[PDB]
Design a protein around this ligand. Structure first.
Ligand SMILES: [Mg+2]
Lengths: 234, 96, 205, 126
RNA sequence: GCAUGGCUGUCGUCAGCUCGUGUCGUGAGAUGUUGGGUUAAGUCCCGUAACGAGCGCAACCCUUGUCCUUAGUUACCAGC
């Protein structure tokens, strides 16, 4: 969490290289040891703690938090520490136009709400002609079972990989919780996390903080769900 | 008995309207026998002013169907002929 | 080009409008009756819209089922037209004639009834498209799954033969399993002749 | 009993072939085999499935064939007797599936199409 | 027949032709519909600022080739 040896042992400090580089990020750098850039260690955790402050500020306010960043290599922690009743997530490539073309996706979730139940029956290959399409819809639309509204918290684990969702977020005005690296640019993201995406430990120790802060947000929402009707502790 | 109509969704669906409604009244009537089918092709030209190799060809059918009694003792089907004629079935009687 | 959508499905979808067996010596003496009946009846029933006129021949006389969506105009004060025509259909068709009248509830889902209204609107000097954008959505609030309407002809212009084409929904035409209506009624304006085609697609199988 | 019924069709022919134990009695439509098929090579082609299965001397053969052409009836018998030989067992099944005798030849004549003159020949243009 | 409806030829039974919403472009546009593999086929698979839908292709129809059931006169002759 806030502990320093969580930052030291996970592999946060190291960057990509010295030629893969961006001087709009270079304020938040510490050195260039052995031709690999070393990120700053002391400005991270004040920024990192205040990111979880506004996660918990939203999480007790009856809204949604969206987890993205689908890489097949190290995105399985996003597959794992999610999929509960307050946070949607994604599993495949981010579709071009989702927040802005949400009227179409409302029509394409109509197929999703049937083909699970439609496999009750199961001719012979004709059952396989429709049970094949259930795999692709599970691969992309499976993580979103929510319908209605727009997610009030986009948590991007990798900014350099997905400029698609950041553009479609700022067209609508929703907060973006990005995790930038050395090479990626700190523009478009709202609450920055100057961290690293080059280890399974660092991608896990960024996300144990996030799914815990919404449980306490739900524990805070369960603390406050009596405040909605009763006024004596409210 | 012999039957003539234009489509097999009448004439082979009115034999059961006769076989059931005569064997009920005691007399024995055997299974109906098909006959060969009339087939007449009509190749007509299709363009108003001439272009010869564009054509269209039709065909008119006529289904036949023959019943066979064993013991004639029922005038029941003689009254039930307006029932057994429905739209396009013609029945010439051969009460064997 | 686009062989007629009844002539490919006589069989798997629809049936004939007239069923009667005839010998080879009287086959061409019942057709000439039944073809100048339909030219007679539609010229009399220009109003009280008529879609289908079926003719059966039972034993030795006749039967006719005229379909209207407004039967009260034809049966007016208990058959003042019914017995009047039944006297005078025998004068063209020497057998005694039956006349039977049903209803065409949902009149905006049969193609002849729709396309007669198009000739009425386009001879009242109504706009060629404001008449037809409203004549498809009205036939899509209730019923069909696809409608095409082609309007071809002079269309008001000087030397202009344009074709309006508007479509909604789904209309197949190379599926014999489906069920398609079709009708071509024309229009005589103060200049030119406008022909209208309608392809109301009801449910399949 | 031992009477065996065999049918076979090739090029709009149809042959009733009866097969029962006997001594070389080959008779077709109350005619001898050399007398019926006048001067052709198919006088031996009707024996080709018979001498393959080494039963040329051990059966009576009674054949009644209708329709077809001259050398189309001879093919009907050859297909016809192979169905009659396999009423016994499937010992000679593999001796005839490999021989290419059991499959009915599907190659039938093709209809005249409009514009064309034959089934596929069309007139000359320039 | 250059005032037009109706009906037919033609490219060509060739595999294409368009729309909705979205984003890029000052705009005419474009993207979907491109890439890799494959197919008689814009037929499929993997990819991917596009996600879908229609017309088409395929199948649905007819006929010919195998067998089964129902049927035996005017058709049929193995047994008598
Ligand atoms: Mg194209």
């Amino acid at each position: 969490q806030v502990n320093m040896r969580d930052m030291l042992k996970a592999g946060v400090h190291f960057g990509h290289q010295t030629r893969y580089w961006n001087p709009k990020m270079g304020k938040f750098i510490f050195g260039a040891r052995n031709k690999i850039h070393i990120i700053n260690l002391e400005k991270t955790l004040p920024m990192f703690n205040e990111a979880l402050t506004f996660v918990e500020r939203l999480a007790a306010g009856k809204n949604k938090i969206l987890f993205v960043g689908t890489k097949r290599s190290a995105g399985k922690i996003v597959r794992e520490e999610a999929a509960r009743c307050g946070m949607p997530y994604v599993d495949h490539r981010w579709l071009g136009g989702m927040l802005t073309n949400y009227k179409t996706i409302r029509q394409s979730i109509k197929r999703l709400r049937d083909l699970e139940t439609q496999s009750q029956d199961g001719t012979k290959k004709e059952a396989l002609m429709r049970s094949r399409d259930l795999e692709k819809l599970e691969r992309s639309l499976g993580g979103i079972k929510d319908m209605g509204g727009l997610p009030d918290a986009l948590f991007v684990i990798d900014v350099d990989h997905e400029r698609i969702a950041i553009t479609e977020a700022n067209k609508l005005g929703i907060p973006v919780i990005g995790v930038v690296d050395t090479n990626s640019s700190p523009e478009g993201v709202d609450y920055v996390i100057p961290g690293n995406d080059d280890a399974i430990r660092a991608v896990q120790l960024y996300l144990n903080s996030m799914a815990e802060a919404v449980i306490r947000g739900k524990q805070g929402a369960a603390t406050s769900a009596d405040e909605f009707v009763e006024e004596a502790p409210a | 008995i012999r039957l003539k109509a234009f489509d097999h969704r009448l004439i082979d669906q009115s034999t059961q309207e006769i076989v059931e409604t005569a064997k009920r009244t005691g007399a024995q009537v055997r299974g109906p026998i098909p006959l060969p089918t009339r087939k007449e092709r009509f190749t007509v030209l299709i363009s108003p002013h001439v272009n010869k190799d564009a054509r269209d060809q039709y065909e008119i059918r006529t289904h036949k169907r023959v019943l066979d009694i064993v013991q004639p003792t029922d005038k029941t089907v003689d009254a039930l002929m307006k029932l057994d004629l429905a739209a396009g079935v013609e029945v010439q009687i051969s009460l064997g | 080009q686009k062989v007629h959508p009844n002539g490919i499905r006589l069989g798997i979808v629809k049936e004939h409008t007239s069923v009667w067996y005839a010998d080879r010596k009287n086959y061409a003496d019942y057709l000439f009756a039944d073809l100048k009946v339909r030219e007679y009846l539609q010229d009399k029933l220009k109003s009280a819209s008529v879609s289908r006129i079926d003719i059966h021949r039972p034993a030795q006389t006749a039967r006719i089922t005229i379909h209207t969506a407004r039967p009260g105009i034809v049966i007016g004060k208990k058959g003042e037209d019914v017995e009047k025509l039944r006297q005078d259909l025998t004068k063209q068709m020497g057998v005694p004639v039956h006349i039977n009248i049903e209803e065409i509830r949902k009149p905006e889902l049969d193609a002849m009834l729709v396309a007669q209204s198009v000739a009425q609107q386009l001879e009242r000097r109504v706009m060629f498209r404001r008449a037809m954008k409203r004549a498809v959505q009205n036939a899509m609030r209730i019923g069909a799954k696809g409608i095409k309407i082609q309007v071809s002809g002079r269309l008001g212009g000087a030397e202009i033969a344009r074709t309006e084409w508007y479509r909604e929904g789904r209309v197949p035409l190379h599926t014999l399993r489906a069920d398609i209506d079709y009708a071509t009624y024309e229009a005589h304006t103060t200049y030119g002749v406008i022909g209208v085609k309608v392809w109301i697609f009801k449910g399949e199988v | 009993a031992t009477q065996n019924y065999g049918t076979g069709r090739r090029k709009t022919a149809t042959a009733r072939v009866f097969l029962r134990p006997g001594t070389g009695k080959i008779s077709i439509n109350n005619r001898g085999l050399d007398q019926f098929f006048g001067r052709e090579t198919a006088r031996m082609v009707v024996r080709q499935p018979l001498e393959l299965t080494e039963t040329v001397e051990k059966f009576d053969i009674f054949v009644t064939v209708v329709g077809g052409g001259v050398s189309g009836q001879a093919g009907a018998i050859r297909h016809g007797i192979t169905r009659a030989l396999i009423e016994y067992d499937e010992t000679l099944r593999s001796s005839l599936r490999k021989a290419g005798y059991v499959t009915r030849d599907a190659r039938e004549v093709e209809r005249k199409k409009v514009g064309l003159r034959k089934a596929r020949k069309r007139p000359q243009y320039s």
